[PDB]
């Protein structure tokens, strides 16, 4: 059971916990800088042991409103933001994604 | 066991069975009009991936703040619970139980 946390970019934290072929995740932090729509989060990459074979789309929600987003974890670990351009908000979201 | 099928309206559902848990990935793009609360009639989820109880799979549309959900009943005839839509790129990775 390996655990990892890192600020992907823009203040967004991603926490991961590997349990066999399944990775448990938790989106954290708050948006502290501007994140462009469909942009790479270049501050931190997901380590190799948590990188999936297939591009995984993690659906999150912004605190206080009806707003949803998704962050993709590709096989490279360079996460991509698929919400619109944003510079504020509290992103949250717990779930799992598969590995091999 | 793995499976992929275009449910309807261009929406793809990719499934992978792992014991009593099904792993899902929403793909494709909306290529035709999908009515609010309508049946996805192009492809049914196969029996081996059909749950005992109705499952609500949450997704997100690329580029904005828009979310939706697709229910998988025991029949596998999925129903769209977003509003009426004719465009957008639906995504979302998650799980649902078989039980």
């Amino acid at each position: 059971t390996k655990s990892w946390s890192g600020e992907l970019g823009g203040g967004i934290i991603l926490s991961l916990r590997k349990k066999g072929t399944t990775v448990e995740y938790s989106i954290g932090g708050e948006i502290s800088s501007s994140i462009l729509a469909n942009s790479n989060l270049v501050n931190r990459s997901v380590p190799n042991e948590f990188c999936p074979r297939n591009r995984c789309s993690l659906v999150g929600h912004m605190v206080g409103g009806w707003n949803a987003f998704h962050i993709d974890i590709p096989s490279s670990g360079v996460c991509q933001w698929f919400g619109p351009t944003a510079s504020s908000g509290t992103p949250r979201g717990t779930g799992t994604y598969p590995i091999d | 066991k793995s499976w992929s099928g275009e449910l309807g309206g261009g929406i793809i559902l990719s499934l992978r069975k792992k014991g009593t848990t099904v792993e899902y990935s929403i793909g494709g793009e909306i290529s035709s009009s999908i009515l609010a609360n309508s049946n996805l009639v192009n492809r049914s989820v196969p029996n081996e991936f059909c749950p005992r109880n109705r499952c609500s799979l949450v997704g997100h549309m690329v580029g904005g703040w828009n979310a939706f959900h697709i229910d998988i009943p025991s029949s596998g005839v999925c129903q769209w619970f977003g509003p009426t839509a004719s465009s957008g790129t639906p995504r979302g990775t998650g799980t649902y139980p078989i039980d």
């Epitope: 591009r55 | 793809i12 990719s14 494709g28 790129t89």
Partner: nanobody, 115 residues
Framework: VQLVESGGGLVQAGDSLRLSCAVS????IGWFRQAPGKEREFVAA????????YYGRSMKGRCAASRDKNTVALQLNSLKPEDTAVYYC????????????????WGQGTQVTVS
Amino acid sequence: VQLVESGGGLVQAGDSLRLSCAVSGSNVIGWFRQAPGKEREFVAAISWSTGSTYYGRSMKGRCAASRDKNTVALQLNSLKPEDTAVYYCAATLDWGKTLSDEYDYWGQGTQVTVS
């Protein structure tokens, strides 16, 4: 994965054109089109392993992808000057991706001009 687009040229409205993706070095081969000063569109996807196909919004009912010759073909029918764009071939391990951002390997492209 190395990708080279063959076929493509000038043709008229209602005509047909067959494109070809010479693949070397992925499971799904995607097809994209971009008209100058326009949004890049997904056209079609084909699985090399299985023969499964998927067609985007752009050319539904007027296009068909096939498998061959490490070749992937894209048949285009009922062509209209709107389908005028550069046609790209792309590769990924994943089904069923429709975004340019979701594809890892790309081809040079091939120009298709209608009317």
